[PDB]
Amino acid sequence: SNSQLNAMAHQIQEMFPQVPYHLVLQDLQLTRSVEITTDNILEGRIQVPFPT
């Protein structure tokens, strides 16, 4: 029942394809605000696991 949260993360994935979609989905549970989630990414709230 988190279709809205999933959809919201889509816009962020579009703006910031550098970050993991699912980790964004998580922040959308945290803040439920893509405006925050995006700044959250920038704060280091959402870490980006590089290819390893």
Coordinates of C-alpha atoms in Angstrom, one line a residue:
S1 CA 0.0 0.0 0.0
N2 CA 3.0 2.3 -0.5
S3 CA 2.4 2.9 -4.2
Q4 CA 2.5 6.7 -3.6
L5 CA 5.9 6.5 -1.9
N6 CA 7.2 4.3 -4.7
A7 CA 6.0 6.7 -7.3
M8 CA 7.4 9.7 -5.4
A9 CA 10.9 8.1 -5.4
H10 CA 10.6 7.8 -9.2
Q11 CA 10.9 11.6 -9.6
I12 CA 13.9 11.6 -7.4
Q13 CA 15.4 8.7 -9.3
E14 CA 14.9 10.8 -12.4
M15 CA 16.5 13.9 -10.9
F16 CA 19.2 11.9 -9.2
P17 CA 19.9 8.6 -11.0
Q18 CA 23.1 8.3 -9.0
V19 CA 21.2 7.1 -5.9
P20 CA 19.6 3.6 -5.3
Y21 CA 15.8 3.6 -5.9
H22 CA 15.1 1.3 -2.9
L23 CA 17.1 3.4 -0.5
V24 CA 15.1 6.4 -1.6
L25 CA 11.9 4.4 -1.0
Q26 CA 13.1 4.0 2.6
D27 CA 13.5 7.7 3.1
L28 CA 10.1 8.2 1.7
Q29 CA 9.0 6.1 4.7
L30 CA 11.0 8.4 6.9
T31 CA 10.0 11.8 5.6
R32 CA 7.3 11.0 2.9
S33 CA 8.6 14.2 1.3
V34 CA 10.7 14.0 -1.9
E35 CA 11.7 17.6 -1.2
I36 CA 13.3 16.4 2.1
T37 CA 14.5 13.0 0.7
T38 CA 16.4 14.9 -2.0
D39 CA 18.1 17.2 0.5
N40 CA 18.4 14.1 2.7
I41 CA 20.5 12.4 0.0
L42 CA 22.7 15.5 -0.1
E43 CA 23.1 15.4 3.8
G44 CA 24.3 11.8 3.4
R45 CA 21.1 10.4 4.8
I46 CA 21.0 8.2 1.8
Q47 CA 24.3 6.5 1.1
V48 CA 25.2 5.3 -2.3
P49 CA 26.6 1.8 -2.4
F50 CA 29.1 1.9 -5.3
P51 CA 29.8 -1.2 -7.5
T52 CA 31.8 -3.6 -5.5

